[model samples]
Target chain A: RKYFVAANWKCNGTLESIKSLTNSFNNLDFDPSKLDVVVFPVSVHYDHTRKLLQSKFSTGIQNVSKFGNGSYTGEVSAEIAKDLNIEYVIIGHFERRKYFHETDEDVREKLQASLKNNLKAVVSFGESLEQREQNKTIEVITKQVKAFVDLIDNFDNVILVYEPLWAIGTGKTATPEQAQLVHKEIRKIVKDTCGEKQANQIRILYGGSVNTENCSSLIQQEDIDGFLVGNASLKESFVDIIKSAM
Target chain B: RKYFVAANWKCNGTLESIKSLTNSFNNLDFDPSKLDVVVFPVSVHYDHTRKLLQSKFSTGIQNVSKFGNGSYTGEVSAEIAKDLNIEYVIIGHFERRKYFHETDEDVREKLQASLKNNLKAVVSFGESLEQREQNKTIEVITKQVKAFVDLIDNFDNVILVYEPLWAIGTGKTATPEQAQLVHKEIRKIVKDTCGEKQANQIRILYGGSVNTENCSSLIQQEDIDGFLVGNASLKESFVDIIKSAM
Candidate 1:
C-alpha cells in the first residue's frame, strides 16, 4: 500500500496561518506514486484551503456528522462534505472523544456516513493514559476498532489512526517497537475478524507527536504505513515527515 | 434601531440550494434605510455564502465557539468568524440548546467571544413546549435571558431572538399577542437588569414558524423588532418577511 500521510490541524489554522502554510506547500516536492498527502483543517478553513491547494494535495474535514442532510443544527454532514469534494474525514480524534463525548457508536455512525458519501474515513482509536497504564491498550483499542469493523462491510476506504491519548501533544511518542506492536495487533484483529484481505488493504497510521526527527524509523516499521501528524504539520518540517514516509 | 431580519437556515442549505437561494436574493430590493437583512447557513457553507452575497445582504454564522482561536476540535471560533468578514453570529438557538446541550453559560461565553472580535451577536432565548404549556414562558425566558445579562457589560452589539421551542418547525407560531407579551417581558428584564436606555436600544426578534402571511402582523407588534425566520427563509416568501419588517 502507498503511504498515506495526513495532517490533522486540530482546531488550529487561521486565514493567515492557512495562507502561509498553503503557500509553503507550493515549494514542497513529493512523488504521488509513493504516497498520498491529505490535510484535515478545521471546518472554517476547509473550503478556502481546498481552493488554494487546488488538488496539489488532497483536503478533508477534521470532523463530520452522521446525519445525511437534516436539522442536526450546528453540524457539518457527510453529504455536505462530499458535495464540496472533501476527500477524507477524521473521526474519533482523541480531542473529540475527550471533550465532545463521542462514543464508539458515534464514531461508527460517522464512519458509515462518510463512506456512504464516498469520502475516506480516517477512523481514530486509542487507549487513554489510565487505560494504557493499566495495560488495557489492546482491549480499549479493540472495542473502538470493532465498532467500525462490525458496522462497515468494506474496509478498503478506511484509514485507522492509532492515537495514544497519553502521547498526543504531550511530546511523548510510543517507541517504534511500541507503535509496531500495537499496529501489528491492530492488523491481526482485523485479519481475525474481517479476513486477511481486508487487513492487508487497510492502512494503519501511527499518530501522536509524530515529527520529522522521529517519523523515519516510525514509518520504516512493517505495520506502520504512514504518519498522522499534529503539531509538526503546522510547521515547514511537515514536508520532511511526508518525505520520511517515502 | 432599524428592523433586523435574519434567516436561520438550520442545517438545510445544500450547494444547489444556496446557489438558487442567493441568486433569488439578487432580485430582492429592500430599503436598507428601514431594515437590515442577514442569513445564517450551516458553517460549512458560511464563507462561500459570504463571498457570494458580497454585502448585498449581510451573512452571519449559525454558531461559534466560546474558545478564542485554539484547540477545540470540530468548533469554529468567533475570532475566525470575524476574520472571514462574517458580521454577525447566532448564539443559543433552540436546536443548538436542545440537541447540542448548549447551556445559557455556553451562550454567554459565545456571545462574549463574538463581541470580543467585534462581531454582532443575535443571541436567542426561549421557553420549551412544557414551559409554555405550563404558563411559564416568561419565567423560563427570564432565567435564560439573565444568563447573558449577568455576563455582558454592554448590550449595544446584541440582538435578542425569542424562539419558543414549541413553535420552531412545528408550524405553531406564538400569536402576535403571545409573542409581544414575551418580547415585552424580555425588554423589561433587560430594562430591570441593565437600565432602560440599554433595554430599549436592544432589538428583540420573534422567531418561530414565521411565514410571510403571518409576519406582517407579527412585525407590527410593539416589542417584535423583527423576525428570525426558519423554514420560510429558504423560499421566495423570505423577501416578504423582509418587506414586512420594513
Candidate 2:
C-alpha cells in the first residue's frame, strides 16, 4: 500500500486559522503519486476548506450520521458529506466511542453509511490503558476488528486507525516496537476474515501523540503504514509529518 | 413578545437546494419588525447560507458542543458557532434525546455553552409517546423544563420549543386547543421557576409538525408565540408559516 497521512483537526480551528493552514498545506512539496493526504476539519469549515485547498489535498468529515435522508435533527449523514464533495470520514474515533457512547454496532452502521455513499472510511480502534496493562490488548483489538468484518466487502475504501484510548491527549506515545505489534496483529486479523490480498493491501495507521519527530521512526516500521496526526495537525508541524512518509 | 420562527432543516439540504431556499427566504413577505426568522441548516452550509440570505433573516446551527476549544473530536461547540456568527442553536431536540442518547444534564450543559458564548438557544423539550399515553404530559414537561431551570438568568436570549414526542413526524398533530394548554402550562412552569417577569417575556414556540395550515391558528393562541417548523420549512411553504404570525 502507498502511504497515507491525514490531518484530523479535531474540534479545532477558526476560519482565519483554517485559511492560514490552507496556505501552508498548498505550499508543501509532496507528490500525489507517492503519498495521499486528507484533512478532516469541523463540519462548518469542511466546504470552506475544500474550496480553498488545492485539489490534490483530499478533504474529509470527522464523523457521520448512521442514517441517511431522514429526521436526524443535529447530524450530517454520509450522503450529505458526499453531496458536499467529501472523500473520507473518520468513524469510531476514541472520543466518540467514549464520550458519545458509540458502540461497535454504531461503528458498523457509520462505516456502512460512508462506504455506500462512496466515501472512504478511516475506521479507528484500539485498547485502553487498563487493557494494555492487563495484557488484553490483543483480545480487545481482535474484538474491535471483528465488529465490522462482515460489512466490509473489500479493503479498497477503508483505512484502519489504531488509537489507544489512554494515550490520546495524554502526551503518552506508543513506541515503534509496541505499535508495530498491534499493527501486525490488525493485518493478521484482517487476513483471516478478508483473505490474503486484502490483508496485504490494507493500510494500518498509528495514532495518539504522533508528532513530526516520532513520525519518521514510526512510519519506518514494517507494519506501520501511515498516521492520523492530531495535535501536530493543527500547526505547521503537520507539513513535516507529511514529509516523514515521503 | 415578537414572534420567532425557526426553520430546522434537520439532517437535510444540499448546496443547490440551500441556495434555492435562500432565494425564497429573501423574497418572503413577512416583516422583520414583527416576526423574527431563523434558518437552522446542517453545519456544512451554515457560512454559505449566511452569505446568501438577506439581512433580515438570522442563521442558526442545529446543535452545539457542550465544551469549547478542546480535544473533543467531531463536534462544533457553541463557541465555534458564535465565532461563525451564528445567532441561535437548537438544543435537546427529541431525536438527539432518543437517537444520540443526550441526557437532561447534557441539555443543561449545551444551553449553558450556547448562552455563555452569547449565542441564543432554541431549547427543545416535551413528553414522550409513552409518557403522553400515560397522561404524564404535565409531569414530563415540568421535569424537562426544570432540567435547565438553574442555568437561565433571563429570557432575553432563550427561546423554548415545545415539540411533543408523540406528534413529531407522525402526521399526528396536537390540535389548537391541545397545543394551547401545553403552551400555557409551559409558561406557568416558567413563571413558577423564573418569576412572572421572565415567564411573560419568554418566547415559547410550538414545534411538532407545525405547518402553514395550522401555524395561523396556532400562533393566534394566547401563549403560542411562534413556531419551530420542520418539513414545511424545506419548501416554499416556509414563507407562509412565517407569514402566519404577521
Residue B206 in candidate 1, Cα distance off native in Å: 1.3
Candidate 1 Cα errors over 4 Å, as ranges? A169-173, B169-173
Tens-digit lDDT string for candidate 1 (A76-155): 88988888888888898887787667889889889888888888888888987778889999899888888888655656
Model 2, global lDDT: 0.88
How close to the true structure is residue B162 of candidate 1, measured as C-alpha lDDT? 87
Residue lDDT tens for model 2, A48-165: 7898889878889889999996788999998888888788999999989988999999999998888899999999999988888898998999999899876777686799999977
Scored by lDDT, the top model is 2
lDDT of candidate 2 over B1-246, digit per residue (tens): 989988999988888999888998889766678778999988887888899899889889889998887788899987778777889899999889989999999999998888788888899999877788899999999999999966787686899999888876566668988989999999999999889989999999998888777888889999999988888999976888888777
Across all models, the iRMS values in order are 1.5, 0.9
- Which residue runs of candidate 2 sit more than 4 Å off their true CA positions? A169-173, B169-172
- TM-score, model 2 to reference: 0.97
Q: List DockQ for all candidates.
A: 0.67, 0.82
